[PDB]
């Protein structure tokens, strides 16, 4: 993985995507991108 560096800065997981983030700002953006998702449909 890209973020496979020895750093404890990456501790943000999106529960739906399983995505690991290292920064808060892009994380919240990704969590705001849930509005672009489809619950089921
Ligand atoms: Zn996500």
DSSP calls for 21-41: ES-HHHHHHHHHGGGGS-S--
Query: Could you tell me if 27 and 9 are in contact, meaning their C-beta atoms sit under 8 angstroms apart?
Result: no
Q: Encoding tokens for residue 22?
A: 């290292």
Question: Which of 26, 2, 27, 33 is CA-nearest to residue 13?
Answer: 27
Structure-determination technique? NMR
* CATH class of the 10-41 domain in this structure: alpha beta
Domains of the chain: which residue ranges?
10-41
Query: Could you tell me if 19 and 34 are in contact, meaning their C-beta atoms sit under 8 angstroms apart?
Result: no
Question: From ligand 1's centre to the CA of 18, what distance in Å?
Answer: 7
Query: Could you tell me if 31 and 21 are in contact, meaning their C-beta atoms sit under 8 angstroms apart?
Result: no
Question: From ligand 1's centre to the CA of 14, what distance in Å?
Answer: 5
Q: How far apart are CA 9 and CA 29, in angstroms?
A: 17
CA distances (Å), origin 32, targets 15, 20, 24, 25, 28: 13, 15, 12, 11, 6
Question: From ligand 1's centre to the CA of 38, what distance in Å?
Answer: 12
Q: How far apart are CA 1 and CA 29, in angstroms?
A: 21
């Amino acid at each position: 993985g890209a973020m496979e560096v020895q750093t404890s800065q990456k501790s943000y997981v999106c529960p739906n995507c399983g995505k690991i983030f290292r920064w808060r700002v892009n994380f919240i953006r990704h969590l705001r991108s849930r509005r672009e998702q489809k619950p089921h449909k």
